[model samples]
Target chain A: KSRFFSDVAETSSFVFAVAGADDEVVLETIRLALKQKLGKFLLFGKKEDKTLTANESVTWIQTDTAEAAAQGAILAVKNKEADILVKGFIPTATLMHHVLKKENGLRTDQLLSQIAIFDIPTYHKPLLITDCAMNVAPKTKEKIAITENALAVAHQIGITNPKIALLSAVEEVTAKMPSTLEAQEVVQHFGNQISVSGPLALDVAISKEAALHKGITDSSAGEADILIAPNIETGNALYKSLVYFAGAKVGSAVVGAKVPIVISSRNDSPENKLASFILTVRLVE
Target chain B: TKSRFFSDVAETSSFVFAVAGADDEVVLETIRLALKQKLGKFLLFGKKEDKTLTANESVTWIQTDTAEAAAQGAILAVKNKEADILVKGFIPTATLMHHVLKKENGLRTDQLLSQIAIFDIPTYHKPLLITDCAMNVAPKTKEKIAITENALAVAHQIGITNPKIALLSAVEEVTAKMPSTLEAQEVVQHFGNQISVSGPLALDVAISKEAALHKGITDSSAGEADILIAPNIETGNALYKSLVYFAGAKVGSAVVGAKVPIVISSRNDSPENKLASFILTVRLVE
Candidate 1:
């Protein structure tokens, strides 16, 4: 898993789709997965498209409305029919609304969070950023859960005892900036169980030389495996910058659910979409 | 002047430094380096015994009892036009700034005092300037405007005519959740007439043309930015250190928005960096 495509076998993982019909991007993504022997699909949608011809492993369940398709997919996963859930043509908010319903049986004690894994050329290994798209302006408690979720993802990807950096504007706990104070609190909670440090700037968190220049010797400085961004704005900007400026390849997922969810953006490239789908395959136990 | 070297600017400006707390070795070594390059003369204010220091050029010593008196004497020298630049020496910055911000017979101005760092990065076509890096921890909406104005003056002095300024934030979109984005938008609106200013832009869009094109931003100021105005000290400091540690950039600094630009830098800065800062102050004096 740490080597991306090398260590994993050419095996199939079960994927359940909600409102997946008539989406060429989703169909092509699933087709690529099948070619790679990565997974097989069970698509639930309003109507099956002509492009998705019948296959031995691929199955299509017809529903009258998009809402029913989403509900049917969630119920199928709850009934142990699928190992993963992916969004296709339906609105994300609508799909998440079904996933979070009390009677849906997909709700978990952990808060649902989004984690994006990047394989940057400049970084030593894969870097994971959490809550980039799921939470807008998460409070300190929400940030704690977000950190925990990212930690789990890092370990699953073969990074044992990942160094988590709680990013803030500064490296010290200041009264004016709420982010720094919240970072201090998060570090306190995760200090014993995990290798965590907080109130660090982006440079100090990722560059060992920068941490040395600033006289910081913490384990998480300049060698972070996971970056817990202060808010959605920081995370989103960093994620986009890595893609457009640094030419990084990314795989993102919605974690903390009962199962991993692939919710890629419509504007993402085909290769990026497949990478995200591979993330789901990797997360399946 | 657009293609001038820093040494050229240093040779043309015959400025004088009024150095407060003038006893530290790092400060003395920096002044010696500047004098070795014929950059400036100095008026040293410190105790007589501590003035045992030497320099390449002769310096005028003004005996003082303590660091407080040294700061006051340096301020008085600048007030009387005896010196064109003020240098902080062995004393704390707060002690020096206390007299610089006094009400009467001080170096006060109507503008806000801000710090600017000029980096000579190998990758850039010209020297890059970043503002408010060490001063103004969390500037308010109006104070950021003032900080920008102060930086623009320094940029103009360094021969950057009509410099493109990029106001940096976490995101380009104006959102209520991030106050810095809203403030960046406001600063962009207010300063558009004076300079080529773009706002609420992330570092990528501000520096990389491909990023700007990907986001559908076609502004000329997007990739041609000469000055980067960080939202606060932390952002500015992080960017500065990243360029220095990761990109291997040489840095020079000066504090603007006063009667004369003040030279303030970290004690850990190299002698070459200190000399570059001295040249930056001399350019502003001219």
Candidate 2:
């Protein structure tokens, strides 16, 4: 029912732990998130930093090292001090390391697949792309995990039956492209349980007219709610092209963890980061 | 630049663009548009058929039936050094490529043939070139070297001096897990100083300087890459389509690594883009 981030996050409230909140862009985004009343914040860094001092909403959790801050944030989630985790100024590897550890309650048997939700002006509804920032070259089984992660996000956002399009260069499953081969396998895995079709190009996946021209009459053609990228290279380039060229507004997070982990680049706009915060907050329900 | 940056140097065209199976009105009309700009001299193959090319022809016309007659003659012209460029016009791509790839035709070398798509994006500061999108499939390190070289040649011909090249991958590090990242690294090491190149870069750092600075990535090619070598066809094709469909970008594409350039514009491409393709191919001619 919710087509926009604001609609998805109407009156939701929770505690979010921001690990290593030393970056200015992250701090400003946290400020915006606070202003929007999305959630309460647990900023983990030096309390000596005067930029965000004496804030009622933020509880400054002082840490000695970047590693300690990441560990502390995950522990805070484990101890019920926070419901969401955010990656701030620390390296992504450092933050993910804590999430993957068995002792760190954030660890799960499921793979941590990253999902980027976009509000594209040209599209009819919000679109989601997965594993663009996380998985490098996922095989068939990993693709299914990636799809499951996307499915969870889609469901949380009020789309119960999301259409998944496994992206490739062409609709035909050929031997030349390993992407199409894996797409075929992923399609076979879900069977009738999920509405998934694949080995479709970008045109056929998102545009019904383009799919019909190519004789792709499947239900997933052109009306996909989520696009499962073949590999990181394809997913990464497609995401960047949409953002830089299409002027798309996006929010993204790492799903399938104990909780949704919000991750944004320093260059990501304040609005993009806010969307991520709200999207992450919605994922808790 | 007429409508884009490609036509900026197209006014001084000198090469010949020979069209194989030039029967479709779309192909004919684009040739006319290119001719109007003096983009290149035209050599039309296939019969006039009394409709489009009978009296409205502006090139050196060769009468023949299509396929074996038209595509055959045009490729021979390339071997004989009579035509500077060959374009697949109303013929099947397999039919045209079969003739181009034949051993006796002498059209190829040890280097692989690859396509370079030129995008006149409104967002970027200059024209962007993407490689191996249409021709090569899953290329290894060696084939990627050839593709990168072909893209570099096209970049140089398009007036970009010492163009920055980014070998695109998921992450900007060489990991044993992902072959594309490792291959990107190997491709960069292959070209010592022949071109300005960087490797294993994601799309953000390759295009956005601010993103590169945020990642603490410091390379000569980071954030200002004029040419991007895609890891595979899926990445390149998707990037191209996303730009055209979402970004409202105008584009032209051509194959390099042959003795001369070649154009095989799909029917979906607009006439203006077809002319842009012509301008792109002809400008690559020696």
True contacts kept of each: 0.12, 0.72
DockQ of each: 0.20, 0.63
- Lowest summed lDDT across 10 adjacent residues in model 2 chain B is found at B49-58
Instruction: For candidate 2, give the lDDT.
Output: 0.82
Model 2 error, position B221 (Å): 3.8
DockQ of candidate 2 relative to the true structure: 0.63
Interface RMSD of candidate number 2: 1.6
Predicted candidate 1 versus true structure: per-residue lDDT over B185-267, tens digit per residue: 89988875867888888776787666577568888788667888888775676566556544556788999999899988765
Candidate 2 Cα deviation (angstroms), residue A258: 3.3
Docking class of 2: medium
Clashes of 2: 0
Quick one: best TM-score, which candidate? 2
Q: In model 2, which runs have C-alpha deviations exceeding 4 angstroms? A: A1-11, A48-53, A212-220, B1-4, B8-15, B24-29, B35-50, B59-66, B218-220
Each candidate's number of clashing pairs is 3, 0
RMSD of candidate 2 to the truth, in angstroms, is 3.0
